[model samples]
Target: GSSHHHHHHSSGLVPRGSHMANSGEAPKNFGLDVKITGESENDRDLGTAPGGTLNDIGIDLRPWAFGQWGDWSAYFMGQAVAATDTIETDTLQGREPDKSYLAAREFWVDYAGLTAYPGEHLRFGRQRLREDSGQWQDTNIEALNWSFETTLLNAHAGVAQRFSEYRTDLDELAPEDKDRTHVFGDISTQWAPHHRIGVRIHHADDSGHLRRPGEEVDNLDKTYTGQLTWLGIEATGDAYNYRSSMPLNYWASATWLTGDRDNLTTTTVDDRRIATGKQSGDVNAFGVDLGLRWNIDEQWKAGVGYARGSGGGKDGEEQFQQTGLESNRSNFTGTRSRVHRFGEAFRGELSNLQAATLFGSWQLREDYDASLVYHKFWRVDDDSDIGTSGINAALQPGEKDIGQELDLVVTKYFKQGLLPASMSQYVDEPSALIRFRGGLFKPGDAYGPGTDSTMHRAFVDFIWRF
Candidate 1:
């Protein structure tokens, strides 16, 4: 009767990432995680980059210690990574430097004395900030946050900003994060047996300066200053959780972005920057994502989804953008595995974009799961540029067709196959697993002639926690 997996005492401050020690084991106060991943790619840029083949073998070590005293508890974790290419797969080869490095992952303290309920807590310091959809917040950052959860309702409130990279190799923040402060909150209530509805808000303030009329902006620098707020509403019917009782699961979300932006405008004249002044404007954009999944049986599931973001207004003001922290990965196929909501190879975001997806997933016993996903994409505004993507092909103006992609993921879990009732946003994978994930993309007419017909990316990962 769904009694085997009830989290009665869990809190919003439980922390994310692989937990090394099982609660039933002795010396559970300390743990470590070892993940070895190897990847091979052929034409991630769709032949746009010269010699586009790339490969990498990376090993990550994460060690953490924890202690609880009365109503206060502290957690600390550190990461050390070594790789033949780069530790992070998202890095573009040749364009960036590569070296082994050490960094801080999470170091936070939590106090639950505000109320008798263990689900309520106030946490401070560097920690993982996340949401179920991963479209809002999903990165580790310094913050003061509060969380409250119960059978009927769940809520979160937080103020977060990054002061440093906390890494040995990188000295500067990502352009989008520099001088940006974020405040976010969400509230969700279970209105029916397995249906939940929620509202979320996130505001970002960038205090960095935009180049003045006579100022010289570097061609390589992409930083911009802006103030933006996102207001969204969402509904889910046990959509991403693998251990749900319902046969039909669904999810829907609609968001609006409004604020002000001051971006640098420049033109390169013979290698010298000519400032065209700052492009200042008001932002008004809208985006929506919706999906429905049919649980055909205990081991098989199928689903379809659609998402679109507004675009094509003055100064790009109407282009919808996701919070800079999002990963856009989730478990929408009703499996133990998580996958990119967009196409894997394309990995496009919901900004000035339209995407349609169909997927099928199946489970074998509890140790193995696989999914096949197909995606078709289009530009919401044919004349405007789409969001960030893996492909390097340039889009032709007035062309709506973007491309199509197919993805395959096969995973085999060991020890503990699946964490029952684990929240989708939590990055914990207590068990070991070997995963093979890959994707193939076909370019559309928007890419024009001479562009490569297909592009692909694939990976194999072996992860263990001890």
Candidate 2:
């Protein structure tokens, strides 16, 4: 799950990018994004490790083609990624090596006119899929998908199969039948001019599917039921005009998930379920998000948001998990080098936490902008599993407040006319995305180390795409 608030606003909150398809769009697209970071801590876990700096980067290339075959719309595309991460002594989630590994991410064929159906689409092979709203999606799989859209409704249905994931040591057998399957769908519509709604349903069938795949695909069936609503103008570049005298954008979404899974939490030797585990009667989890933004004008934008992920009380219990498959979930009240939290002190998962943020931005120029954000975080499930976890970990004997954060973000865009027209072909706002974020974190009474702690972090990033 991810949340991205673009600073491109005519008011303060601007329209989101559209999902429309342009069949004749054929070209090779690629880009680079890199970040340099430095961080310090009064103690790490409230009072743990001091801190250090981490650098990361991503390079993605996509050669896509769209055309017609006797009036049938045909699309051929391939996606590739080379990304570096940050690794720490404690977490195995980031910066695997000095550099990143090249992965052949996707190869797919799309035939949009096979049935002469206006909203039908068919695609196969390694591909990525996300919900219409960017809140909770980023699914990659080798699957077959079918989708359709009517005058006011759009629907999606697909089946995915994977033989390996992050399964490290749950089961070490080269089992012949260890593949997992996912059956998922989305029913959504923008029937109302200012309103868009959607319902999502996902089911995971992991019986004998290993604990973490390739590395842990534990056995079980997990279901995620989600719904979302968007209210605002939707467009791009110069098309964000709204009826409201003051441009306003807002959105809200929620997800409720349920399932039964096996766990290896044995306390006694006699219960040598040592390698075995137990099934839950009915495990459940949930997530939510709220956002609102107001554009004071074409050059100033301010926004606020709160996102929460259900917390867990005991270990081995299934909390609301988008999926253990894809990575990149951190933030400060989110972090990086992990699934959620991209970067920050409370940089933790969405689970068992309540987080809110306020932000404002100024357009320094047609291609330059600056923004500031303040984040406040609190514990949702005090009985967290990670003793050092602050976002939503187990609180100390008598602690609750996780902490607060102040983040300053500045971004520079490489627009067309800003550079030479010869280079302008690839230069618009799509070219460069340079960003910097500096922030401080204060551990609350519930934070830890028993002593007052202050955390500091700074980062610089540069990205260019063609």
Candidate 3:
């Protein structure tokens, strides 16, 4: 074991996770990792499913391998899952039948010889693409990506596209992902002692065809194509670094989008297409998210945030949307725990939506952590549909009040092998964890009277790494 304190990326511009005192080095030649997780979930359905509720218990076996020789490295990972019911959550291979399946997640190779420093490298193949905020980009895909990090500056550039799922469950790609390409870049600098600023850009091109009139199409097929670009600016003051020396931390971001969309509308009767036509238009939108955190004490903190996105434009010209890669999860409250920006159960996106949040968090040394969050949601445009949400209740017309949600999360860590939540997706870091996460939602006037007025989603997780 080495006592060296190695900076993961060597850039203060990007916040990092808790530091381990011993920080022993992983195997330099070859290493294997194993993780077992047990989960129980209740997906709160509003009379949508037969029983009006979606619940299940599942277990996951994740095995990963890595090989490193000086400046060259290779990695691979896979997952095997077994569940009590058909799990539809993004965390699992939903296409699997019989509530069990296997999938290949990532297989990538890297070369660090491009630079003398450890922070500069090039990677090719299926790998994890991530950002600190988990907003601009967060997914595993096939691509070529480059990253550069220094004491004062950090940057990343990548091009990505999905070719295969590498799973034993499904036989087809997701309709929206087919023929789609993504290009993105980010650059940031640390201007002050504990603050940083940056700019980010993402572009998405969909080359899928728009159905022609009288052209037969499957109901699950995509009938639209678009080329969209997003540009944004952001600033932070140790917002995500829980061990900040400052008393207050903050985060702010604003973004704009412009694009063109070609969509075809199909009229069908009894599953038989009668007519179809194309509708093309220009698209433009704007959105913002801002938050502030007050470190009340060594173990307690509180925060507030507000976010909104433009919507209700004709031909989808002004409805803001995410890049489709975001997980909307981050560690703003504490270092050991991560919570969803929006409601955990509702999981609303930032398109045509408004969200106000308040939260309080606590930490008991490096062993335990907890967070209580409250969210109030509203529609940016009463007549337009909000972005994706966990609520299955249909929205009512002429209503702006979406709903309210309360979330609670508690975690107990068994060892010092803990990394920041944002970085965990790319690295199997945590040694052992026991966590309970739950959320309760109350419907507003936006929902019809027949909809469920009160809904809830709760889950308990047990994870261990070897």
Candidate 4:
């Protein structure tokens, strides 16, 4: 709780449940971290997945600075990312950029607390953005934002822009020639002392020049743009047992997408007319989630939740976008979504999905923590939908039943440092950590027309912080 202008990585670059206060105090801030992980995947269900090893070596640096003049203060946060992968398979996991490179994951500045604008927060930059539990529009982009809080309510509004580009990666083979702009906002109201309700508005206007990745004039679909608007509402806090010492908390969110299709996409196969993308029409999509948790005791906590995204019918565009998965756009991999977890596997996208989870955690000892989780998944609806694996994908085919999963996770921390921590302590200070996860996923009868791929995976992470 030190007075600092820097944001939190534990929460988000900016954070969701926004709005906080400070009395013009600031602190020196700098942070660095490293992580190395091992993973496994054995999908024998759909004849598509193959058992293999996937490992990652990564490092993160988040250093920030604050400047104050008179009664006004300015802040800056910068992020550096480096990573390499060893996914010895044909899966997307194997498709990650298999080398190390540095990237500016985030660069932003903030202004707040003034005699004229006492309760206002203004931020501008390329950073992470997610609101209302990320029911919609959770990605990084060049944006300008304005937020403020009062004793009465918390509100937010922002605008973002992304330029069109092209790439050739395992996931993206075509021209990613799409320029997009997004406008979003949210509001939070206090219903009771410890209970609150929040709502969000997200709109994306994307115009993709659907031309081939060649030198000739390849204007297939001129100004092929897609417009989307998503509205969402959420309730948070310990409404049912707010007065209890070990309060029981619950959350529920519902989101709807309504917009015009106007030829969502178009393409030519065999020098002719054949669209591999979605056709023009109306969009009908939605996502709903519910969860409840208890403190159980000082050391133990338990919770359960259900999340589902609408699936396309026998025809045109009926997919709910569960954006905000993760991304490394530097490698042409944009921010995307996937299933909550089919074991420890990235079980495709949330489109056409019905998923439920039961999870619990325990602080067995002082610096040690553990958790157990279970998840059930099914198709809200589908049709050979690989596009469903990612938000950009058109849509797909599946069934009401898909898979099941179980996972065990553990974490350990040390006030002392590691090798990197020791080396960096001379410059700053060292904070080291470790993480491990193991899980299994079993496919249902509807997993694939072929095999019912059963998946098993385990990973360990060695972390260093400074």
Candidate 5:
């Protein structure tokens, strides 16, 4: 049986560097930023035991050079992070020291603005790639670190070839492989003096891999993304379109991916265990998002969004299967082998804000937010051809559905010297996130009672930026 519990909590200091060279005008040269984080957790599931504590330390440096040909500018950036537990306990088992480092988080070079108008340019090199709505694909710390590694790996490896193996080998021999590279470009222009629009695009090949006894496997996956945004105000105040007198903004974006896996014949291992497989498969995925924002008054605003996702299939290739595996079920079907393989999922969110001070020095504010999300499967087709009873029953399939999450966050900031700078501003600024989540439905009997769980967390973060 699973038990439920609720709890709340929480707590960067860093420096600056040169502006550039020759210009003596803070030359846009380079600088370094570093942050150290400490956190604690407590849950009821582990016998009222104090959840493990952790410290995360990260450092980032960037250097830029401009004005050569046209409006050309080039820059290089690198970041590394390491985290570890502060208490000794096996409760959060397997989450030990060795597994705590996100060492090569990000390192890349960017170049742009040489061809288009000033400020309107392009950037190329290995850097972070994020698309879709913020919920499914965001670059914020708490969400980015976990979601990127999990979702991206699953999507890239679903195909026949092994993308992970290739990454491992490159990491061993070529230090640069750790930095995923791509060609990125963007165009920005003023639409109506005060109004502006920007368009951006990115393309890259999969750099993941897998290793075999005498050979190395590479999954050749490719991805592309595009986005467009508009910003401006509608009509003038009182004297104009009396109905509306604030700013209006909107954005739309999409992404497409396709690729084949390498060396499908070899068995693959994950988390120390061999994954069951038909071995070979192909992958295809597409997603789109649209959002709008309205400024009702000087101190209040609201926004809403919609998104859709779909695509996934096996490549007609097959391999030998392991025996004695009495049961197996398709994630998309209720009958053996007749499992559908479509990854169509959809979600939406609505938000509103009210603040007493907007980015002002001596102001105070609070925000109220909420969102609901859901997913459903519409088809199930099996990949195996054996038609054996045992294999058929093991492959039962069905549609899976995820429940919604309700969340609320609040934050407050105080001026420096209010109390002790070290203890107040750098160690106890108030901030918190509270959320409730659970699975509402699952394929076949895959999800049971205790599987539906909820989590609650609260913390305070302190920041000192120089």
Candidate 6:
């Protein structure tokens, strides 16, 4: 009788006949999930100023469906976030908190095709985009909707619209008046089973913000990136390549970007004429990262990584030199108009130190997990392109050599008790987070140093799934 029923089906279907029928009736397919998180932080200024506190709260809802069509499914998720914090006017002065809220978090559509052997599907809509390492930039949070996939290889392509004003804190006098659009795409291929190579490209246009005296400048630039990675290498025992017990995974990447200067203009005390923006020359930049991980035992693991960026002045000519601005050496960091300066003349070198981490989770014993990470950022060369004299006389370089950050994360879960199926399951869990970050420099007369900057954060969060 069950096999004769046309609507009956099993959870896992085998593609055999033209029409596959379940041996038993399918179960009702619908579910809802909800989550909420809250965070707060307190800091005490270590140098010449007083420190304050900041707080944030967030909520998320997710709902999914199954068995709508023989092999079709869908899911929807959205999030809301609110935060409050005081503005730090001086290094020593304590400030009050400013509150803000955002209504949209993640809104998208998902479809899965179970009919195919290896399995494949397509997702189109607004979503967060994160790459392999996320070292260069990530979650800086603007807005984007991209198409992504993982098949014989992994690849993603999309056009993103950035709605934020383009103003770097380094330019004190420049108003936040520029907004632009960026189109980006990335593709990766598996040359061998354990090895893969990929490339990324992004182009941005800033023709909309050219309204000031020299605003007609066409601010356009392109970034090109390439990377190679090797995974799952047995690097321990007799096979160890560098004397570590853990498997080895390595990745190397480089990026080159070019700038546009046809519309650039410059202004001087004596003459205000169109001149190429500083750092607008043909730019070349490259970086390398090396990492190693060791598995000491079942419960412990460690890793180390290093990265470096070329200095600004290495290109021979001043990176930011334009015909009109005569005083300051054109540097990449000092200029905020263009998104990338690949062929630019300035130098901006960077180096980093990373220590391995250890993570463990006890699934049978109360479900506990924890991790520790240490990261440091150091300036390898002086940023001659920044500071007041370099860009404008009034604006000073903010800070160089941002310093180091140490982080620790611990999480625990609690099972639900008696109550409504929805209310009880959602209201019975709690979580906590503690994060701390501080700078290694101090505020300087020219550009601030990390020794004077420091920050600390802590929060307790709760979540419910239905």
All candidates: TM-score: 0.89, 0.64, 0.89, 0.73, 0.44, 0.54
The lowest-lDDT stretch of 10 consecutive residues in candidate 5 is 1-10
What is the C-alpha lDDT profile of model 6 across 1-466, one tens digit per residue?
1111111111111212112223353543443344454544443332324433446565544343434344343333333333344322111101112243223333344344532432334434433344434332232224333333444455445544444312222222112113334556666665654456777665554444333454332223211111111111111121112122334434555554444422324555344344345433344444454444454444444455454544354442222211111111111111101101111111112321111212221111223334344544443345443311101111134434433445444444334431123333322222221212121122223334332344444444343433
Model 3: per-residue lDDT, tens digit, 234-281? 999988886776889999999999998787788877878743888888
Ranking by TM-score: 1, 3, 4, 2, 6, 5
All predictions: root-mean-square deviation over Cα? 5.4, 8.8, 5.5, 7.6, 15.6, 13.2
lDDT of 2 by residue, 282-343 (tens): 55667776667676776666677787766664552435555433332312111111112322
Where does candidate 6 stray beyond 4 Å?
Answer: 1-52, 55-75, 82-102, 109-119, 136-151, 163-179, 191-194, 214-246, 261-279, 314-366, 384-402, 413-454
lDDT of 5 at 110: 29
True-structure Cα RMSD, model 1: 5.4
In candidate 5, which residue ranges exceed 4 Å CA deviation? 1-181, 184-201, 207-248, 259-284, 311-399, 413-447, 457-459
TM-score of 3: 0.89
Error of 4 at 26 (Å): 5.8
- Model 5 lDDT tens row, 1-466: 0000000001111122222112344433444433333333322121222432233322222222223343443433333334454321110011123423323322323233333323222333322333211222112111111111111121110101111211211233222122233333333444443233444333333354333343433332111111111111221111111123346544444444344334324444542323222243443444444434454554444444343433223442221111111111111111001110111111111101000101101112222222222333221122222212100112223422222222222223333432233354332222221212111222223122433243222222223222
Clashes of each: 0, 50, 0, 13, 30, 42
Highest TM-score: which candidate?
1
Stretches of candidate 1 above 4 Å error?
1-27, 87-97, 219-223, 416-430
Pairwise lDDT winner, candidates 5 and 6: 6
Ranked by lDDT, the better of candidates 1 and 2 is 1
Worst 10 residues of 2 by lDDT: 1-10
**Clashes, model 5:** 30
lDDT of each: 0.77, 0.46, 0.74, 0.52, 0.25, 0.33
Candidate 4, residue 348: the lDDT equals 48
